[PDB]
Design an enzyme around this catalytic site. Structure first.
Site, PDB file in Angstrom:
ATOM      1  N   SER A  46      -0.143  28.656  16.800  1.00  0.00           N
ATOM      2  CA  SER A  46      -1.444  29.011  17.432  1.00  0.00           C
ATOM      3  C   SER A  46      -1.885  28.137  18.563  1.00  0.00           C
ATOM      4  O   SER A  46      -2.838  28.489  19.224  1.00  0.00           O
ATOM      5  CB  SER A  46      -2.570  29.093  16.397  1.00  0.00           C
ATOM      6  OG  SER A  46      -2.278  30.093  15.426  1.00  0.00           O
ATOM      7  N   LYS A  49      -2.154  29.852  21.936  1.00  0.00           N
ATOM      8  CA  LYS A  49      -3.392  30.501  22.333  1.00  0.00           C
ATOM      9  C   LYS A  49      -4.073  29.877  23.519  1.00  0.00           C
ATOM     10  O   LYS A  49      -4.342  30.620  24.443  1.00  0.00           O
ATOM     11  CB  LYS A  49      -4.397  30.581  21.213  1.00  0.00           C
ATOM     12  CG  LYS A  49      -4.103  31.735  20.301  1.00  0.00           C
ATOM     13  CD  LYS A  49      -5.018  31.732  19.114  1.00  0.00           C
ATOM     14  CE  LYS A  49      -4.714  32.862  18.156  1.00  0.00           C
ATOM     15  NZ  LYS A  49      -3.706  32.587  17.159  1.00  0.00           N
ATOM     16  N   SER A  93      -8.824  31.544  15.214  1.00  0.00           N
ATOM     17  CA  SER A  93      -7.383  31.603  15.353  1.00  0.00           C
ATOM     18  C   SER A  93      -6.823  33.023  15.079  1.00  0.00           C
ATOM     19  O   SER A  93      -5.795  33.185  14.425  1.00  0.00           O
ATOM     20  CB  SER A  93      -6.706  30.557  14.482  1.00  0.00           C
ATOM     21  OG  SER A  93      -5.479  30.224  15.095  1.00  0.00           O
ATOM     22  N   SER A 184      -5.801  24.018  16.446  1.00  0.00           N
ATOM     23  CA  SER A 184      -4.914  23.834  15.335  1.00  0.00           C
ATOM     24  C   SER A 184      -3.780  24.863  15.377  1.00  0.00           C
ATOM     25  O   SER A 184      -3.884  25.896  16.086  1.00  0.00           O
ATOM     26  CB  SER A 184      -5.688  24.000  14.047  1.00  0.00           C
ATOM     27  OG  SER A 184      -6.064  25.363  13.975  1.00  0.00           O
ATOM     28  N   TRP A 186      -0.329  26.303  12.687  1.00  0.00           N
ATOM     29  CA  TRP A 186       0.558  26.179  11.524  1.00  0.00           C
ATOM     30  C   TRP A 186       1.569  27.313  11.640  1.00  0.00           C
ATOM     31  O   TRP A 186       1.266  28.432  11.318  1.00  0.00           O
ATOM     32  CB  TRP A 186      -0.242  26.297  10.235  1.00  0.00           C
ATOM     33  CG  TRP A 186       0.527  26.080   8.937  1.00  0.00           C
ATOM     34  CD1 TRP A 186       1.895  26.133   8.749  1.00  0.00           C
ATOM     35  CD2 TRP A 186      -0.026  25.808   7.659  1.00  0.00           C
ATOM     36  NE1 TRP A 186       2.210  25.898   7.453  1.00  0.00           N
ATOM     37  CE2 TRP A 186       1.057  25.714   6.742  1.00  0.00           C
ATOM     38  CE3 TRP A 186      -1.317  25.635   7.190  1.00  0.00           C
ATOM     39  CZ2 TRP A 186       0.876  25.442   5.373  1.00  0.00           C
ATOM     40  CZ3 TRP A 186      -1.499  25.363   5.832  1.00  0.00           C
ATOM     41  CH2 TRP A 186      -0.404  25.273   4.938  1.00  0.00           C
ATOM     42  N   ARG A 226      -4.937  18.415   8.825  1.00  0.00           N
ATOM     43  CA  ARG A 226      -4.606  18.189  10.222  1.00  0.00           C
ATOM     44  C   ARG A 226      -5.791  17.615  11.001  1.00  0.00           C
ATOM     45  O   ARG A 226      -5.660  16.634  11.721  1.00  0.00           O
ATOM     46  CB  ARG A 226      -4.122  19.470  10.844  1.00  0.00           C
ATOM     47  CG  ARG A 226      -2.646  19.800  10.522  1.00  0.00           C
ATOM     48  CD  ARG A 226      -2.375  21.250  10.747  1.00  0.00           C
ATOM     49  NE  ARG A 226      -3.197  22.044   9.857  1.00  0.00           N
ATOM     50  CZ  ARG A 226      -3.456  23.318  10.047  1.00  0.00           C
ATOM     51  NH1 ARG A 226      -2.968  23.968  11.103  1.00  0.00           N
ATOM     52  NH2 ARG A 226      -4.247  23.956   9.191  1.00  0.00           N
TER      53      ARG A 226
END
Length: 242
Positions: A46, A49, A93, A184, A186, A226
């Site tokens: 992500s 983005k 996200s 963030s 993952w 995170r």
């Protein structure tokens, strides 16, 4: 070096392989449990983005005010079954929104634009809406910090208004006039899984410290680590005090 020691001590309680890179426009510095991660290329997940929003807005495929309407087909999370601006989707996200954006951009333009900006290995494969989630696109934590540092300073090769719009989509919080921006990530569909917390801190006077946490994840890890960890680090560094 006691500051650096205190940052390393936070990593004592972290089992996973992890690196935290900082960039202040002059020097790269590296902290964590596995430093060679910094020069290792992983999928952006992500955090892509960021580049996707820039490319989209630069090339008139969307505006930052435009609403991406839910098409009624239920999505991976219930939270995504609604309408989003690009900035609302950045913070939630919301993968399918950025997939739609990527489809508007198209493979030919997505490709040529990543080449033009030197993003990671600039590889997209044949699926214009999958490549940041599954590969083949990869990028190093060092490349991510340099990228977001440039964004912070309006030094990327995009229109200034484009950069400012995307920059503010990443705004998280401030303390006094110090501002924290972050994204963030993952990547769950690769082995090993990769976790990211990429961003920068903008001081009162325009000084910037960019940072990129990159670590290995696995199923069932605490979603919020995170960020917690990045924040703890930034506090110990004296970059973003609690």
């Amino acid at each position: 070096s006691i500051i650096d020691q205190n940052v390393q001590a936070l990593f004592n309680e972290i089992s996973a392989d992890a690196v935290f890179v900082t960039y202040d426009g002059q020097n790269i510095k590296k902290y964590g449990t596995h430093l060679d991660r910094a020069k290792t290329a992983y999928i952006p997940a992500s955090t892509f983005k960021i580049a996707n929003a820039l490319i989209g807005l630069e090339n008139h495929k969307a505006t930052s005010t435009e609403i991406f309407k839910w098409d009624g087909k239920p999505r991976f999370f219930k939270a995504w079954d609604k309408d989003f601006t690009l900035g609302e989707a950045m913070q939630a996200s919301t993968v399918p929104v950025y997939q739609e954006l990527a489809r508007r951009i198209g493979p030919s333009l997505m490709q040529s634009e990543l080449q033009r900006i030197g993003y990671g290995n600039m590889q997209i494969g044949t699926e214009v809406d999958q490549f940041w989630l599954k590969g083949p696109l990869t990028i190093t934590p060092i490349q991510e910090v340099k990228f977001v540092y440039d964004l912070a300073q309006g030094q990327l090769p995009f229109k200034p208004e484009v950069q400012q719009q995307v920059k503010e989509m990443l705004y998280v919080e401030r303390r006094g006039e110090n501002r924290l921006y972050a994204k963030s990530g993952w990547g769950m569909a690769v082995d090993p899984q990769v976790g990211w917390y990429v961003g920068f801190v903008e001081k009162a006077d325009g000084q910037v410290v960019a940072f990129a946490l990159n670590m290995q994840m696995k199923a069932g890890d605490d979603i919020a680590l995170r960020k917690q960890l990045s924040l703890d680090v930034l506090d110990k560094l004296g970059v973003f005090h609690y």
